[PDB]
Design a protein around this ligand. Structure first.
Ligand SMILES: C/C=C/C(=O)SCCNC(=O)CCNC(=O)[C@H](O)C(C)(C)COP(=O)(O)OP(=O)(O)OC[C@H]1O[C@@H](n2cnc3c(N)ncnc32)[C@H](O)[C@@H]1OP(=O)(O)O
Ligand SMILES: [Fe+3]
Lengths: 56, 75, 123, 125, 100, 29, 101, 494, 55, 488
């Protein structure tokens, strides 16, 4: 838990803004229109937590 | 007294505060928008009164034509 | 501490549409639907209130007869909802509305069958 | 949770959690009051229309029955609440919300700190 | 007696469309096809009437109706395809969820 | 010293033209 | 093709030209006509820019909005000028350049 | 035709006062309880004082509508509307303005949980009700009366005590809407003849006998649901009992008067032949209701159900007097209307005092309150006496003057109506003794508090009002007699 | 269906259409009677109206 | 030659703008450079701009729309009535589009083609209003219907949306075939399709004994198609299912825009035409059936959308009563009712779309709304009391005219039906107020606050509803103006 908190608290202004935009862009989904377009939208790695902090 | 400009400005102010309240925001969240709303309400009220006058003027002529046509039957 | 959450805990088992049996946990005094939604057996979003007026049989369960004796009999509104929500418009004699079943200590060990979920998210 | 129930921390409506209280994976049903400096541990449940005294300690998985006053370390039954007492609880929540509104009006949507950062940068070239 | 016979030809096509609606509770594809029969019967009436009255307005509308029939068949079969894809079957017991 | 986003500059000019044109439209009508 | 400009409701102002040509109508544009055209084009470009920021295409969105605005603004100005020249709208200016010229 | 009055104090400002109060309150934060309370109370008090001034400038010699003023609806001026009062409606306006501040004062202690929504609803009710009492048009009467249903619905449903308030509010809204729709049908029927709905005009237009009968039946259906008359009286018990105390006060003190006021303002004068043909029918329904509903009141076990059931008997005596069509009958009917609006409200106030402390309405739980609440017991006894039409109280003046008017027309209806004296005394004294007299029951109730300073002040204007009209009713009868005389003489010329 | 079933159905339908032709001829042959009946009924209505308009 | 097209500047502009938006959306939605951005909101804003510019072009060039009327005569006819009807239609389209942006963003409906189909259906309804021939009327109706069929199935993976699309397509094609049959019968009997030629041939005879059975049945079948279109009983059962199953913006658009376009068509085909009271009896009986069925079925509903659908059916019955009576005031009151119902429906659907961010589905979901959002609960109650017809709210005009026409046209059964249905409607409308204000549920639903568009539209519609009767003259005069433009 310390690792994820230390990573988040040390981010610079520019990275904070980039990840705010990413979080907004990937908050919802329209996989149906993606399938019509023939594309698959993937969650960027900066928004994925390590497996060692997940409940599973 | 009570004029179209005053009523329209008050209604524009009321709409902005009603819109802020529907969004659970403070009444005076963006006061420049209140100024804009008062201006728009005043413009809309003056235009509405003028339009009502014009509409009544046009309806009078059209009713004149209708009555002339209906009075043609008794000739 | 004299009073414990385990006093209200009612053991249960649920058989999913694919047939695999799961031991689930619910509080007496709450509905069977809430116990079923704790582990996601029934999607909580599909049935957010425990009211008969907010039910399209999303909470429907099937219960064998040995446990139906231990429950209050179905009211007219429940049977109306079950019958209309059936695909064939046939009332199922073992069917119950999970939002109307209140868990009690007398329901320990009861087996419940969870049918396949109906569509519920109206566009 | 040791009870097996979902371990989310749920503070329902009209709940007054007194200052310096520690909550972890506890459920508080609507219209309750938690006394100052109380501790609610994992899986514990406080049923609706209950009051915990200041300094109370609720061990893991323990329960506060509805319509009662409890307190102590560990929490023990004190007495049963009168109906007027239970009517007082949402009133306390509403009053605290009214007080918080006075603090909410002290802040505009943006701070002016960014100007201080600007000038602290400018002085530094 | 020419006109009455042409008209009864169109009439039987329209009636067959109505009957196809009545007789196919469980077959919605044939319900669509019955509707297409009704549209053909109307298109023929316009042509027959245009010939009978010596007037070209019937034929212009006959061409435009053929365009409408084509578009409506295309979109209808699209809706059929998506319904089938979602359910995996065309049986009418799986398209009755909306009711009341 | 200079604003570099050329699309933003064009949009700013467009908004200014809209405002000034609205004012002139009212004044000459 | 037989054509007939005859309108249902008669003009209420002096008819300077009953069927003015395209180039004549355009050459009849007043400063008010250019003001209406520029306002509509500017508003359209602004809406294109503001609506295009979220998808990330503010430039192309500005272009599309500006095309819609140019089309609509020309249409509105041509409408006003032609209606003035045909006497459907108050056209004291057109009558001045007709009595004089 | 502009009819603007020359008087400084006019109907328009009295109408605007509570509207301004409501508009001001919508914007004040609910956190500012002290300010909200004081604004509402001050607005209602100013309105009451304005109504008193309106009383001061009243002319008791004229039969012409007074303070008449007009308001334009269209620039075509085809449809123009008028406001005016007479000797028949003045006192009802004053009563409305007196009762509203009482309603604000009743919920003073709970205004932290009520909020601006409570004061706003009562102010909107006040504005609509005064408007209704001040109209010289059949159409505006319908709109403003039909409009009072929304705030009363809200008041019953939100601040009612139990879950029975759902059914009660439903029945109230639906019964009143049915009656109002029937009135609307009558208003359009009149409009098709006359081309207008102006009272001053329709008073001068003759209606055929057949159309008089039909228009009377449609006006009857509307007014008889609001009187109330048997058998459409059953909405009143649930509605008046389930409502909050101030809601009950408004429902019984003001809203009940709209039907009998509609008989006096429209049905009786406009259709004088239809009125005569239907007098035996009115007499039968009124006399049945007095006897039946008084015996029902005897067997009620709920404090509020007894008081609410009492109003049905009193209003049907009012209908008897007003259809007697003489000075004593109509003058007595109006006086009982105002007196009932004071006695019934005070009795609802007495029960509300008891329910606020103990949260029960069952009579069997109380008893022996004289030894713990002597001040409440003394005030409860006075208003209990005023409900029995005891001479000296205001309600005796209206009751006897109606019996005088009924006796000169039909002796039989006067005798059946006079049975209200025996039955009215039976349940009123039974209620008082079962609640106040006897021994305490500490297993049910062991903690008591007599009236506080606010509750004492609330009752004082009620006590002064009933004694004043009871011993010297000339101040009221002086200002009513010319309007009453012209109401009776309407339609005949000998 | 079998080919012969289809052809038997076509023969039945041909007989049905010839019967329809007979029906159309019959309907054509009774135009004069129908117009005569229409005229008599119209005269009845007109006489009744003229006699009722008298009062 | 160019100046002849001044009569069709609005349609030319809106069609060209729709083409531009189609190309823009397809070019940039497929772009890898911009990571295939959703463009529903971008195209939606540009299309709202296009609709507003079309409205400006139409409103400002009021006399120019009648230019070259002889040249355009065999294609359409533009007059005062069509002018105001088209302005109303454009305003309705603009409001409906403005209510869609939160749905595009939060649901992530990324299809920009939804906006394009709405724009094309708007072009179709524009052409419907100005139609003056059976051929043009049918073609414009069909363009409109095809757009609606496509958008009703826009959530192509949803069982409800696909089911609604299928039922819509089948029943709409059936009714369209019936109407086309009616047109063919009329053409064969009269040798004409232009509305003027039909007016001349039919006037003066109606049913004079020797009655053209072809003209009768043509009128009958065309009326059946129109009654299907206005959701009138017994051609109504598609509407509740389609309204419920379609996406909520689709339902909002279908509940307002198509009624204006088809009532314009009904008034120009029959009132401007000539036949016996048979058609008036058709609409009379359909109005009575619609009021009764709408009231009872709405009383049975537990879901908000189905309740609104049945309420709309009841109100079209109330409106068609005005068509049946066949007077100038009947047409005026029909127009007034359509206007007020459109504004009230937009108010209600703005509230429903605001609550759909939290997935409101049942009436019971509105429990404790007076606590969690007091101003919103009051706004919805003002709308519900307007729906019930309680004065002084704007909804009272429809009730007033319903009873006025009945006691004038001499009807008393109609008055009885109106009274009973009004009381039933009041009950099931105030049930929603009781749910938001009186109930104390164990579990609450906390709703996300609405966006600025819906709040502004809600504030304006709420002010109109509460205050229209204080200054109603412009609507009365403009509707009277339109009613007379139909005949003279
Ligand atoms: C992944 C991250 C991990 C972390 O970092 S943990 C984060 C912070 N969480 C914590 O610190 C939780 C610590 N857990 C505990 O303290 C806990 O109590 C504890 C773990 C001692 C004890 O918890 P128990 O449930 O196991 O308590 P007992 O079984 O021993 O009960 C004995 C008795 O003591 C009494 N009771 C027990 N606990 C206490 C106390 N403390 N005081 C007073 N009285 C008590 C009580 O009367 C009990 O009787 P009953 O109620 O009839 O069962
Ligand atoms: Fe359920």
């Amino acid at each position: 838990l310390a690792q994820i908190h230390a990573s988040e608290n040390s981010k610079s202004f520019e990275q904070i803004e980039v990840e705010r935009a990413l979080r907004k862009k990937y908050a919802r989904k329209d996989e149906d229109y993606d399938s019509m377009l023939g594309i698959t939208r993937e969650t960027p790695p900066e928004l994925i937590l390590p497996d060692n902090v997940l409940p599973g | 007294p009570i004029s179209a400009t005053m009523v329209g400005a008050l209604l524009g102010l009321g709409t902005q505060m009603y819109s802020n309240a529907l969004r659970k925001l403070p009444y005076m969240r963006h006061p420049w928008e209140h100024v804009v709303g008062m201006g728009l309400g005043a413009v809309f009220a003056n235009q509405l009164v003028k339009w009502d006058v014009k509409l009544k003027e046009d309806l009078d002529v059209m009713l004149a034509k209708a009555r002339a046509a209906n009075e043609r039957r008794y000739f | 501490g004299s009073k414990k959450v385990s006093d209200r805990i009612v053991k249960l088992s649920a058989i999913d549409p694919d047939g695999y049996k799961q031991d689930i946990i619910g509080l007496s005094g709450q509905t069977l639907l809430r116990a079923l939604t704790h582990t996601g057996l029934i999607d909580p979003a599909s049935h957010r209130l425990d009211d008969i007026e907010a039910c399209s049989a999303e909470c429907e369960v099937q219960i064998a007869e040995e446990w139906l004796e231990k429950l209050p009999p179905r009211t007219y509104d429940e049977e109306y909802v079950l019958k209309r929500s059936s695909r064939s418009r046939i009332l199922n004699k073992h069917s119950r509305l999970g939002c109307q079943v209140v868990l009690t200590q007398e329901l320990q060990g009861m087996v419940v069958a969870v049918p396949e979920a109906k569509p519920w998210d109206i566009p | 949770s040791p009870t097996g129930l979902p371990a989310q921390t749920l503070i329902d409506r009209y709940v007054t959690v007194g200052a310096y209280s520690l909550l972890r994976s506890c459920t508080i049903e609507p219209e309750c009051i938690i006394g100052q400096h109380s501790i609610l541990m994992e899986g514990s449940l406080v049923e609706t229309r209950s009051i915990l005294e200041a300094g109370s300690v609720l061990p893991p998985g323990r329960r506060i029955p509805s319509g009662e006053l409890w307190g102590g370390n560990p929490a023990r039954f004190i007495r049963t609440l009168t109906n007027e007492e239970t009517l007082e609880i949402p009133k306390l929540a509403v009053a605290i919300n009214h007080l918080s509104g006075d603090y909410f009006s002290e802040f505009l949507p943006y701070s002016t700190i960014y100007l201080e950062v600007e000038k602290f940068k400018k002085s530094l070239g | 007696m020419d006109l009455i016979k042409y008209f009864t030809f169109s009439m039987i096509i329209f009636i067959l469309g109505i009957w196809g609606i009545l007789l196919n509770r469980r077959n919605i594809l044939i319900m669509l096809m019955s509707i297409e029969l009704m549209l053909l019967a109307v298109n023929l009436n316009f042509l027959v009437f245009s010939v009978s009255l010596d007037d070209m307005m019937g034929q212009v509308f006959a061409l435009l109706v053929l365009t409408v029939a084509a578009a409506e068949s295309a979109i209808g079969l699209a809706i059929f395809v998506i319904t089938f894809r979602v359910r995996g079957t065309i049986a009418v017991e799986f398209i009755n969820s909306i009711q009341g | 010293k200079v604003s570099e986003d050329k699309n933003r500059n064009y949009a700013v000019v467009a908004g200014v033209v809209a405002i000034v044109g609205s004012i002139g439209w009212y004044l000459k009508a | 093709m037989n054509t007939d400009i005859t309108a249902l409701e008669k003009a209420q102002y002096p008819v300077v030209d009953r069927n003015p040509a395209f180039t004549k109508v355009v050459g009849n544009f007043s400063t008010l006509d250019y003001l209406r055209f520029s306002t509509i084009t500017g508003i359209s470009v602004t809406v294109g820019y503001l609506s295009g920021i979220k998808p990330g295409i503010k430039g192309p969105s500005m272009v599309t909005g500006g095309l819609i605005g140019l089309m609509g603004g020309f249409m509105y100005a041509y409408q006003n000028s032609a209606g003035r020249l045909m006497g459907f709208f108050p056209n004291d200016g057109e009558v001045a350049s007709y009595q004089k010229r | 035709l502009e009819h603007f009055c020359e008087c400084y104090f006019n109907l328009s400002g009295l109408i605007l006062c509570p509207v301004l109060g409501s508009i001001i309150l919508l914007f004040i934060p609910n956190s500012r309880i002290r300010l909200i309370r004081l604004i509402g109370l001050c607005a209602s008090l100013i309105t009451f004082l304005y109504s008193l001034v309106l009383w001061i400038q009243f002319d008791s010699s004229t039969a012409k509508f007074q303070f008449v003023e007009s308001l334009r609806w269209l620039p075509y001026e085809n449809i123009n509307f008028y406001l005016g009062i007479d000797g028949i409606s003045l006192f009802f306006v004053i009563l409305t303005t007196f009762l509203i501040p009482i309603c604000i004062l009743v919920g003073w202690s709970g205004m932290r949980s009520y909020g601006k929504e409570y004061i706003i609803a009562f102010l909107i009710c006040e504005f609509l009700m005064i408007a209704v009492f001040c109209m010289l048009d059949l159409l505006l009467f319908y709109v403003f009366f039909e409009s009072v249903l929304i705030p009363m619905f809200i008041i019953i449903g939100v601040w009612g005590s139990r879950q029975r308030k759902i059914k009660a509010a439903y029945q109230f809204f639906l019964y009143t809407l049915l009656g109002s729709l029937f009135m609307l049908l009558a208003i359009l029927l009149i409009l098709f003849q006359t081309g207008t709905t102006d009272l001053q005009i329709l008073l001068t237009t003759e209606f055929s006998e057949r159309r008089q009968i039909f228009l009377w039946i449609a006006f009857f259906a509307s007014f008889a649901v609001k009187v109330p008359m048997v058998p459409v009286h059953i909405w009143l018990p649930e509605a008046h009992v389930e409502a909050p105390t101030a809601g009950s006060v408004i429902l019984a003190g003001i809203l009940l008067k709209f039907g009998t006021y509609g008989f006096l303002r429209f049905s009786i004068p406009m259709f004088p032949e239809a009125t005569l043909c239907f007098t035996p029918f009115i007499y039968t329904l009124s006399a049945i209701a007095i006897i039946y509903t008084s015996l029902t009141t005897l067997r009620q076990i709920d404090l509020k159900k007894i008081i609410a059931y009492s109003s049905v008997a009193h209003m049907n005596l009012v209908t008897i007097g007003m259809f007697s069509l003489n000075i004593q009958g109509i003058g007595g009917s109006i006086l009982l209307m105002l007196s009932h609006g004071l006695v019934s409200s005070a009795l609802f106030l007495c029960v509300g005092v008891l329910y606020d402390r103990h949260k029960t309405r069952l009579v069997r739980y109380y008893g022996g309150l004289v030894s713990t609440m002597p001040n409440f017991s003394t005030i409860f006894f006075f208003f209990t006496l005023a409900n029995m039409s005891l001479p000296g109280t205001s309600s005796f003046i209206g009751e006897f003057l109606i019996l005088v008017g009924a006796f000169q027309r039909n002796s039989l209806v006067a005798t059946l109506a006079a049975l209200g004296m025996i039955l009215g005394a039976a349940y009123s004294l039974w209620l008082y003794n079962r609640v106040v007299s006897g021994n305490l029951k500490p297993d049910f109730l062991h903690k008591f508090s007599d009236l506080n300073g606010r509750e004492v002040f609330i009752f004082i204007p009620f006590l002064v009002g009933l004694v004043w009209m009871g011993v010297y009713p000339k101040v009221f009868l002086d200002c009513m007699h010319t309007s009453v005389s012209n109401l009776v003489q309407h339609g005949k010329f000998h | 269906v079998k080919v012969l079933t289809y052809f038997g159905m076509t023969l039945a339908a041909f007989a049905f259409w010839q019967s329809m032709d007979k029906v159309h001829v019959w309907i054509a042959l009774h135009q004069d009677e129908k117009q005569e009946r229409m005229e008599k009924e119209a005269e009845v209505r007109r006489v009744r109206a003229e006699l009722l308009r008298k009062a | 030659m160019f100046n002849l097209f001044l009569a069709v500047f609005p349609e030319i502009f809106i069609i060209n703008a729709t083409f531009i938006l189609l190309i823009h959306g397809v070019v940039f939605s497929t772009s890898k450079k911009y990571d295939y951005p959703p463009l529903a909101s971008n195209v939606g804003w540009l299309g709202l701009l296009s609709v507003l510019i079309t409205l400006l072009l139409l409103a400002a060039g009021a006399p120019l729309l009648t230019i070259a009327h002889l040249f355009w005569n065999n294609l359409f006819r533009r007059d005062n009535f069509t002018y105001f009807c088209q302005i109303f239609l454009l305003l309705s389209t603009a409001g409906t589009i403005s209510m869609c942006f939160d749905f595009f963003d939060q649901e992530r409906f990324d299809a920009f083609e939804f906006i394009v189909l709405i724009l094309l259906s708007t072009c179709g309804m524009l052409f419907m209003i100005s139609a003056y021939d059976l051929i043009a009327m049918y073609l414009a109706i069909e363009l409109q219907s095809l757009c609606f069929y496509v958008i009703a199935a826009s959530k192509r993976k949803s069982e409800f949306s696909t089911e609604a699309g299928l039922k819509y397509l089948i029943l709409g094609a059936f009714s369209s075939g019936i109407l086309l049959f009616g047109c063919s019968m009329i053409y064969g009997s009269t040798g004409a399709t232009h509305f003027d030629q039909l007016a001349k041939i039919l006037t003066g005879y109606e049913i004079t004994g020797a009655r053209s059975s072809g003209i009768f049945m043509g009128i009958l079948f065309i009326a059946v198609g129109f009654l299907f279109k206005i959701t009138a009983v017994p051609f109504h059962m598609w509407a509740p299912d389609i309204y419920e199953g379609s996406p909520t913006p689709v339902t909002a658009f279908l509940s307002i825009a198509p009624k204006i376009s088809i009532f314009a068509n009904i008034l120009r085909v029959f009132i401007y035409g000539s036949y016996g009271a048979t058609l008036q009896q058709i609409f009379f009986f359909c109005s009575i059936a619609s009021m009764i069925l709408g009231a009872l079925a709405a009383m049975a509903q537990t879901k908000v959308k189905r309740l609104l659908a049945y309420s709309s059916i009841g109100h079209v019955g109330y409106i068609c009563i005005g068509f049946s009576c066949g007077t100038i005031e009947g047409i005026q009151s029909l127009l007034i009712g359509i206007f007020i119902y459109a504004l009230m429906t937009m108010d209600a659907f703005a509230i429903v779309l605001a609550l759909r961010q939290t997935r409101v589905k049942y009436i019971a979901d509105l429990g404790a709304l007076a606590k969690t959002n007091p101003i919103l609960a009051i706004t919805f109650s003002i709308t519900m009391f307007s729906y019930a017809g309680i004065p002084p709210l704007a909804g009272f005009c429809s009730k007033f005219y319903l009873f006025f026409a009945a006691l004038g046209c001499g009807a008393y059964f109609l008055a009885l039906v109106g009274v009973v249905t009004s009381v039933i409607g009041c009950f099931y409308y105030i049930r929603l107020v009781k749910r938001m204000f009186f109930d104390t549920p164990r579990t609450w639903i906390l709703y996300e606050p609405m966006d600025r568009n819906k709040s502004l539209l809600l504030a304006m519609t709420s002010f109109f509803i509460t205050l229209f009767l204080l200054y109603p003259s412009p609507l009365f005069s403009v509707t009277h103006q339109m009613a007379l433009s139909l005949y003279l």
